[PDB]
Nucleic acid binder design. Sequence first.
DNA 1: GTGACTTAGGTTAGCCTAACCTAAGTACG
DNA 2: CGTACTTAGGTTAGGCTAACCTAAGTCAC
Lengths: 225, 225, 90, 91, 138, 138
Amino acid sequence: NDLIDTTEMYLRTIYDLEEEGVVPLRARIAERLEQSGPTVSQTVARMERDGLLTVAEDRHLELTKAGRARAISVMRKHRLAERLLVDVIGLEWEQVHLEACRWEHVMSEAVERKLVKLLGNPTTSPYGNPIPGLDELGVPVDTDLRRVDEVARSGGGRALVCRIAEHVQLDPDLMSELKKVGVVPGNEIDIVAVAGVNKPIQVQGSEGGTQLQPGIAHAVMVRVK
Amino acid sequence: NDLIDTTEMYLRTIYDLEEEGVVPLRARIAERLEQSGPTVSQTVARMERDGLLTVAEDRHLELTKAGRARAISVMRKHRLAERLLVDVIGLEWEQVHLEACRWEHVMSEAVERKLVKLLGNPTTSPYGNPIPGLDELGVPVDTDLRRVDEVARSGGGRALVCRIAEHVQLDPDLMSELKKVGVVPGNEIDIVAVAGVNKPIQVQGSEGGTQLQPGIAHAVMVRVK
Amino acid sequence: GDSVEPVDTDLRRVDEVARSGGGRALVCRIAEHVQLDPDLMSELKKVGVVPGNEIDIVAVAGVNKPIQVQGSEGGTQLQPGIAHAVMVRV
Amino acid sequence: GDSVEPVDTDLRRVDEVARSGGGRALVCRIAEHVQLDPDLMSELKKVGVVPGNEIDIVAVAGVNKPIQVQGSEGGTQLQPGIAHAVMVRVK
Amino acid sequence: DLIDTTEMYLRTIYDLEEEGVVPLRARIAERLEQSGPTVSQTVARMERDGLLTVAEDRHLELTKAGRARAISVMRKHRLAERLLVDVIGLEWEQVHLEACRWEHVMSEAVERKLVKLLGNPTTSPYGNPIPGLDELGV
Amino acid sequence: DLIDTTEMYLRTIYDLEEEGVVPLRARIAERLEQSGPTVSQTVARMERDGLLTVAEDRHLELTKAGRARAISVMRKHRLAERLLVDVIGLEWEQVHLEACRWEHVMSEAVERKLVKLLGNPTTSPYGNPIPGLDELGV
DNA sequence: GTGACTTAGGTTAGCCTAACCTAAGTACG
DNA sequence: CGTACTTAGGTTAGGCTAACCTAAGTCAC
Ligand SMILES: [Co+2]
Ligand SMILES: [Co+2]
Ligand SMILES: [Co+2]
Ligand SMILES: [Co+2]
Ligand SMILES: [Co+2]
Ligand SMILES: [Co+2]
Ligand SMILES: [Co+2]
Ligand SMILES: [Co+2]
């Protein structure tokens, strides 16, 4: 699959991992962008050379000031594009991320400002993800939010769906399933209890239930009632 | 197409070009070893990093003392292998270079010394090429030699075949033709006259005649009567 | 293909209208080549060389001569390449 | 596969001959594993553990014990891995 | 810079055919600001892949496949321009430079949604007809 | 170092079969002085390429294709040893280390010439039978 | 509890195409 | 004699597989 811009996608993959509370290693970029170990290390070396990140002693990737600024810029464009596609153009909910994944690379700051006004200063994507770096475009606590997997291991119960991470949005067939049964932002779900890590978590939405994989359940954030 | 050892073949290709009186550019290595421009520049940069050669301002490749020593080492193994294959094993004349092209990468100095004694201190390959670096292994002006192309342009005439360059030996079907019509070391040929450059030279041997391409004719050295 | 071969055959290029002895014409198309120059597109908007507006094409003689046009809010000089890339109906 | 399963079924390993109560035997094969150690091969040549030579295999008891061998030009101790990799015909 | 080299070479040849200019490699070099050798090489790569042919007089002729892709990119370009002017309200002069990038990333799924939103437009905001609406199914 | 990783893994498995040892990945690691992960990964590549299979009891079984290649490398090896000892006169102890590299570059054309020169040998200088002489045509 | 093997995340060497460049030629009308 | 294009020899970005590594697990007699 074509990344359109390699540098921007590497930066945004590091941002995604930080948002999901996962350590940003080159091994993560390899499995997510589906590129070889040698390819990722070489591309990270060019970005380190250009001064957009640094590799720590424990191998974890750290964004520079320029790197973080660029990552936020790309993510802002992504989630503004997703808003436009849902609210105005009316592209189907499951296909919006894929489209926005390409648009984030071609959108100017000029258009971003026009979109902020057209969309009424949106603060979240259609998947509940906060839109960052609005300060440079001329414009909640998030502590109470817990991961579906961590809730299930801790006892389970009822909770309100708040965020679906970028990682989850890549699979349109899954996003079609989540919409069908009703695991969407602003809907209540019942999270069945499990014991230990790497266990498929069961959830019961408004129009039925389904099974989330450990990496999918970890990516969905909720507020327990 | 497997080189067995990339470094050794790059070193030997630069040596070959120096013997044929051609400027050793990366463009030449790309043509001869059939590798991409980007591949050749990267491999030359690794050999430069390890102090086996340097790239000049006019971008011609210059061997270091360690580089020249290694190049001579490989060529010595090559031409001692060709001698063994012809004189002792009796591998067909046209197939010997291709075999020696692999053997030059796996032969020890220990075996080279044993081969010198078995072959009676050979000074030339079966194709009339001087065997270098025999001083390191414990053991003729040839200014009168001229290139078949340079003889043809200058008038032509009769001459004794002395050397066939490594470049020519890579084509077995050509070496089969040269053998039959009798354009081999120690045989007389009549080089027909041509005008200008980049023109196929006609030659009449002991058992008929054939046509040599400009790069083939430039690679065959002779002594004119 | 209305793009390459216009359905309305009466469509003509500004430079051809100029060379043929000028005329009042309705601006219809501004080709992609013209749009690449933003400063020029601003000038075309200001004087009113935009689709839907009538313009006056001044008569010209020769090739590689700037074509003079008059819009609602004044006039401007088009380069031959630019004038060739603007189509009108007379 | 004379390599894997010998046609001469009488062929036996030095370690197995030792454990069975020694015997005089003709050296036949030295496996590729033995040849990897050049210093060992020098010692085998010196004392005469080479194909086409008779050797005396000293009786041994237990596993992972050095096998004592006597050649025409003296004797040496083979490691169990080495002794396993040398094949002979008894007498 | 160009986002997609192939699509921009195809759309540049389409532009020259709309302007009634002879589509030569020299014309592409000028308009995309690339050296003659670059354009000759990229055109050769596009000829190899079956997107165009170099005629006896050296004019670039799009193939069936080349024209299909050229129409696809131009359709996306002119629908993007309408959205940028009619809905988003980007300045009339800046729109083309934006749509010039958007034309390379827009799916046919978005195009069909844009056709509904904009009320079946036949032209761009600069009066240029939108081709290949047949191929969308609208 | 190994010159050809695939051929050295195949010949190492053939060696263990000749010694009547169980061919395990742990055995290859010891003898070629490589880490367990390296040997598991390389064996997996050779399994993917159809040169061997890992049995239920984790012992490495050469395929029809794998055995043919192993026989070919061993035949080259032992003919090289005979040439090195009988003709060239390299010292009895250094010969194997030389033939260990030669086995990877020798053509079947040379093998047939060596068979004539050495007078149809059935064994190496170390008494080990020469396999796959049928396959040469001799 | 040692031996065999897996999991996880790297490395260098040695290949590739696409897509840009300059300098210095040729072919033409 | 300027326009169009070729020849020749590069460049960086962005991909790949093969074949090596260490550290820290699991699994099984
Ligand atoms: Co998204
Ligand atoms: Co993206
Ligand atoms: Co040769
Ligand atoms: Co070679
Ligand atoms: Co436009
Ligand atoms: Co574009
Ligand atoms: Co051996
Ligand atoms: Co070997």
